[PDB]
Design a protein around this ligand. Sequence first.
Ligand SMILES: CC(C)CCC[C@@H](C)CCC[C@@H](C)CCC[C@@H](C)CCOC[C@@H](CO[C@@H]1O[C@H](CO)[C@@H](O)[C@H](O)[C@H]1O[C@H]1O[C@H](CO[C@@H]2O[C@H](CO)[C@H](O)[C@H](O)[C@H]2O)[C@@H](O)[C@H](O)[C@@H]1O)OCC[C@H](C)CCC[C@H](C)CCC[C@H](C)CCCC(C)C
Ligand SMILES: CC(C)CCC[C@@H](C)CCC[C@@H](C)CCC[C@@H](C)CCOC[C@@H](CO[C@@H]1O[C@H](CO)[C@@H](O)[C@H](O)[C@H]1O[C@H]1O[C@H](CO[C@@H]2O[C@H](CO)[C@H](O)[C@H](O)[C@H]2O)[C@@H](O)[C@H](O)[C@@H]1O)OCC[C@H](C)CCC[C@H](C)CCC[C@H](C)CCCC(C)C
Ligand SMILES: CC(C)CCC[C@@H](C)CCC[C@@H](C)CCC[C@@H](C)CCOC[C@@H](CO[C@@H]1O[C@H](CO)[C@@H](O)[C@H](O)[C@H]1O[C@H]1O[C@H](CO[C@@H]2O[C@H](CO)[C@H](O)[C@H](O)[C@H]2O)[C@@H](O)[C@H](O)[C@@H]1O)OCC[C@H](C)CCC[C@H](C)CCC[C@H](C)CCCC(C)C
Ligand code: L3P
Ligand code: L3P
Ligand code: L3P
Ligand code: RET
Ligand code: RET
Ligand code: RET
Lengths: 227, 227, 227
Amino acid sequence: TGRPEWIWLALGTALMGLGTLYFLVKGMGVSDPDAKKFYAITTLVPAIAFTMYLSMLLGYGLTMVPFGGEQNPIYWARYADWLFTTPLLLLDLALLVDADQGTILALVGADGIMIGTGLVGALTKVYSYRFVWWAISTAAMLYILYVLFFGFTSKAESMRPEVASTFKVLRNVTVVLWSAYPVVWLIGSEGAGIVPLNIETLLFMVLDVSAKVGFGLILLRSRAIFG
Amino acid sequence: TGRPEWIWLALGTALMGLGTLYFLVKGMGVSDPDAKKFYAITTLVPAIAFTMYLSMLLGYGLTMVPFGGEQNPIYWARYADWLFTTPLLLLDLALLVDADQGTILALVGADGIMIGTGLVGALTKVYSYRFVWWAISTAAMLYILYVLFFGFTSKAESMRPEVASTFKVLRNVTVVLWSAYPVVWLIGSEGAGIVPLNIETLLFMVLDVSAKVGFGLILLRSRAIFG
Amino acid sequence: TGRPEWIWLALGTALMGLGTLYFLVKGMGVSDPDAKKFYAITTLVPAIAFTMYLSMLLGYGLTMVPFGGEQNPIYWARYADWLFTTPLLLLDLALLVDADQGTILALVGADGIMIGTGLVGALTKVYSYRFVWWAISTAAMLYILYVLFFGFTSKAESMRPEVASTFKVLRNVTVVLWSAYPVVWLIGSEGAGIVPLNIETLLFMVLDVSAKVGFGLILLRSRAIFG
Ligand SMILES: CC(C)CCC[C@@H](C)CCC[C@@H](C)CCC[C@@H](C)CCOC[C@@H](CO[C@@H]1O[C@H](CO)[C@@H](O)[C@H](O)[C@H]1O[C@H]1O[C@H](CO[C@@H]2O[C@H](CO)[C@H](O)[C@H](O)[C@H]2O)[C@@H](O)[C@H](O)[C@@H]1O)OCC[C@H](C)CCC[C@H](C)CCC[C@H](C)CCCC(C)C
Ligand SMILES: CC(C)CCC[C@@H](C)CCC[C@@H](C)CCC[C@@H](C)CCOC[C@@H](CO[C@@H]1O[C@H](CO)[C@@H](O)[C@H](O)[C@H]1O[C@H]1O[C@H](CO[C@@H]2O[C@H](CO)[C@H](O)[C@H](O)[C@H]2O)[C@@H](O)[C@H](O)[C@@H]1O)OCC[C@H](C)CCC[C@H](C)CCC[C@H](C)CCCC(C)C
Ligand SMILES: CC(C)CCC[C@@H](C)CCC[C@@H](C)CCC[C@@H](C)CCOC[C@@H](CO[C@@H]1O[C@H](CO)[C@@H](O)[C@H](O)[C@H]1O[C@H]1O[C@H](CO[C@@H]2O[C@H](CO)[C@H](O)[C@H](O)[C@H]2O)[C@@H](O)[C@H](O)[C@@H]1O)OCC[C@H](C)CCC[C@H](C)CCC[C@H](C)CCCC(C)C
Ligand SMILES: CC(C)CCC[C@@H](C)CCC[C@@H](C)CCC[C@@H](C)CCOC[C@@H](COP(=O)([O-])OC[C@H](O)COP(=O)([O-])O)OCC[C@H](C)CCC[C@H](C)CCC[C@H](C)CCCC(C)C
Ligand SMILES: CC(C)CCC[C@@H](C)CCC[C@@H](C)CCC[C@@H](C)CCOC[C@@H](COP(=O)([O-])OC[C@H](O)COP(=O)([O-])O)OCC[C@H](C)CCC[C@H](C)CCC[C@H](C)CCCC(C)C
Ligand SMILES: CC(C)CCC[C@@H](C)CCC[C@@H](C)CCC[C@@H](C)CCOC[C@@H](COP(=O)([O-])OC[C@H](O)COP(=O)([O-])O)OCC[C@H](C)CCC[C@H](C)CCC[C@H](C)CCCC(C)C
Ligand SMILES: *C\C=C(C)/C=C/C=C(C)/C=C/C1=C(C)CCCC1(C)C
Ligand SMILES: *C\C=C(C)/C=C/C=C(C)/C=C/C1=C(C)CCCC1(C)C
Ligand SMILES: *C\C=C(C)/C=C/C=C(C)/C=C/C1=C(C)CCCC1(C)C
């Protein structure tokens, strides 16, 4: 159930909270409309994560789902968060590399399906079905990582060195971090309950804070965000 | 209830599924950013339809609603699908004709209301009220078909013949197909239960597959999508 | 509970309804793509408000939430409305002043959080927590009013007099009107139940109709919306 993981939820809330404040207090004197975009997108990512982490700490983002033959604790807030949060990160990568609107739409589309589908799976009552949805969700993610890695990099090679290198660091961080989510999910309370909800929430916390604050820090502290 | 229509749901899932694969495997070597947009938009339409048709086949997209004096089987997944799916189709028509942002916003707005309002109606408990919502939803749709037929055609007359003719075919297919939905709804399990849920699901399946795969095929196999 | 406020809900439905019709019947012969945008955005604001006010009058937009030690009547339809309705108004102000995409994204982002967070609060079961969410929601709003007042005005000073003056009127109307919502909420049935649901619904009605129809009238009847 949901009680012993309260500490990882409280620390996540705190970290996202400070992360938001920090980025806010850094983009204040930014005149460049391009840089402005990056700060806008990158700052909202942790702000949203903050509200959803708080809904979990306070119990609102937790629901109970019966499957297998039991009542399981499902933190649904994560999907609400990721629904808007993952496309924003992808938007950062797209602007940095100047991606075609066509591809930006395909990624956002793929990403919405990846999260929607993941939510469905998490709330499904027939234990066996949850893994069908997991399969579909992972197929979507692979498609997004494929484009970021092979498609975007190519696009980044045409920009100046500062942009290409920063994109390369962000690229490696998101590909590695994002792929940990489906595994954590599969082995956690949403799938085969091998790992306790306690450790699971700690894993997501490290992944979420790394994928947003870390990502943001790497991006917002470089000169790439400028023209 | 929901059991005998499983075959139309399974066939729809299959068809949307293959339809997605096919479009994916066709836009692969497309360099034109314009064409890229059309493939992106047109491919996501069936992909979304696939996930929602699967949620209905697996039972997740089905809920029970009391009205009249009974518990009625309401497939709510359809609205989730159409919410993002109908505006994307409209986006295809808009790009093909180069519509004003003002009008694109009015259509997407009208369309969101048409689906939201339709969802409300489907889930309302006071039998009589469901038809008030149906009335509002149909008013919205008529407004969208009006613009597509009279407004868009005019816009299409300024493009080269290939574009004008393809737009004309797509225009006639969507106007005819879309107007069948409110009728199916009115005479189906969501309204006056004249037609059984069995036949109803078969009707929607033919309409959905025609409105997306068919539409996509007509669009993606022409040279209109190019500059 | 929900019954004696039916009259304010019926009058709101009526007013939004007529307000929509009127704007529709005024933007008909508009050729200017810019003006077209304003009519599109401004017209959908009341159209959405109409569907949500109707869902409240008909009872669908009302739910029951236990907190304090009682079952409280929570009109959740308001959030559905405002979710899309407040960002559209902000879009009007942004176009009128020609705001940077960066800032438009920050405002829409801030605004989505303000409404989402407000919804959460309204539906939370732990009485004390509802005010934490109220605090976060108000912080977001203050951030939006800050930018509109200090940021946008500056942007408006570079436009021609007609635009600057209309923006100034709209600016003062929204800053004053918007700030009344959190107070009404805090002292209404969603917070410290000082004011009865009866008077509360009357307050929101005057605020909603003023913030949309009024706003729209001031905007759509000026020459500012033109190039
Ligand atoms: C403008 C855009 C384009 C914006 C669109 C936003 C919208 C569409 C997002 C939806 C996101 C999705 C992904 C999340 C939804 C998940 C969904 C499946 C889960 C739904 O449940 C939660 C929902 C409803 O809450 C509830 O109210 C009902 C009505 O009163 C009740 O009937 C429900 O029961 C109630 O559910 C709650 O309580 C349950 C309690 O049960 C009990 O448990 C306790 C335990 O101690 C005890 O045992 C009791 O006895 C027992 O009964 C609990 O189980 C439930 O889980 C739940 O707590 O909530 C609505 C959430 C709201 C939508 C989230 C807001 C998220 C943030 C703030 C969004 C910010 C977004 C901006 C827009 C992004 C901007 C950037 C872009 C530009 C890119
Ligand atoms: C980024 C964007 C801008 C994205 C925004 C996305 C979001 C806002 C979309 C919402 C779309 C709307 C239109 C659909 C919502 C409809 C809503 C009214 C219906 C809600 O119900 C379903 C919801 C919740 O599931 C449930 O979990 C709760 C919490 O644990 C429970 O409390 C609920 O009870 C539970 O409901 C399920 O189970 C019920 C079972 O009851 C039982 O029946 C069985 C029968 O055998 C038996 O009798 C049992 O005894 C009995 O108890 C059942 O009745 C319910 O129907 C339900 O199954 O589900 C959340 C769905 C999720 C939001 C859908 C995802 C859709 C897809 C993947 C979206 C892809 C979108 C991308 C974003 C588009 C990209 C393109 C654009 C760029 C244009
Ligand atoms: C394309 C976009 C990018 C679009 C995205 C749209 C989407 C994500 C918007 C979501 C907006 C959010 C903010 C609102 C959700 C609030 C949420 C917390 C509340 C959820 O509840 C309502 C929901 C479900 O209804 C229900 O169906 C379930 C399945 O069958 C049931 O299990 C639920 O119980 C049922 O709930 C209803 O009934 C309850 C009744 O209980 C009873 O009370 C009576 C009283 O007499 C009696 O006592 C009975 O005995 C007792 O049991 C009741 O309490 C509940 O409140 C409820 O009535 O509803 C879905 C709503 C739908 C999503 C709203 C549509 C809004 C409008 C039309 C949107 C227009 C938007 C366009 C897209 C904007 C365009 C412009 C942009 C370009 C900027
Ligand atoms: C514990 C916390 C995490 C909890 C907080 C609750 C939180 C959920 C609610 C807050 C809402 C929050 C999500 C909003 C985030 C917005 C974020 C995306 C900001 C990114 O923002 C980007 C910019 C857009 O820039 P601009 O206005 O267009 O500037 C134009 C300039 O004049 C140059 O013009 P030129 O090019 O022509 O030369 O933000 C605008 C720039 C402005 C000009 C400067 C803004 C200053 C700010 C008002 C002050 C910064 C914040 C404070 C340090 C403290 C924060 C308090 C919090 C409670 C709001
Ligand atoms: C049974 C199934 C229905 C179930 C599947 C589950 C499903 C729900 C999840 C999958 C996600 C899916 C929704 C995503 C759909 C995306 C779709 C919208 C694609 C439309 O996509 C449009 C393009 C965007 O193009 P680009 O990257 O910008 O190319 C630039 C080029 O270099 C030219 O540059 P120049 O102009 O300067 O000259 O997609 C990018 C083009 C790439 C360069 C090429 C992409 C190749 C693909 C990776 C391979 C195609 C797919 C495979 C045949 C099999 C599909 C497996 C499935 C499980 C993913
Ligand atoms: C009681 C009621 C509140 C309940 C109603 C239910 C309601 C919820 C459902 C209705 C949907 C509604 C929300 C839709 C609102 C849309 C709104 C945003 C409209 C704003 O709309 C802006 C424009 C977009 O313009 P354009 O088409 O691009 O014009 C191009 C022209 O050719 C110039 O070209 P040039 O620049 O190259 O020179 O709308 C398009 C302009 C068209 C060319 C003209 C349109 C005419 C209309 C069809 C008629 C107006 C409406 C009627 C008076 C009655 C309304 C009935 C109602 C039931 C629909
Ligand atoms: C806020 C930051 C990040 C990096 C979140 C990204 C999340 C995902 C890519 C989650 C993917 C899922 C998959 C691939 C399969 C099962 C369900 C998930 C939604 C967890
Ligand atoms: C996926 C393809 C299509 C063509 C779906 C379009 C759906 C509609 C236009 C549905 C309209 C409705 C109306 C007009 C009235 C009652 C409720 C509906 C939502 C079914
Ligand atoms: C349709 C018109 C308007 C002007 C609506 C605007 C609404 C708000 C700014 C509401 C703000 C809230 C705050 C600041 C705090 C508690 C919850 C609210 C969502 C009501």
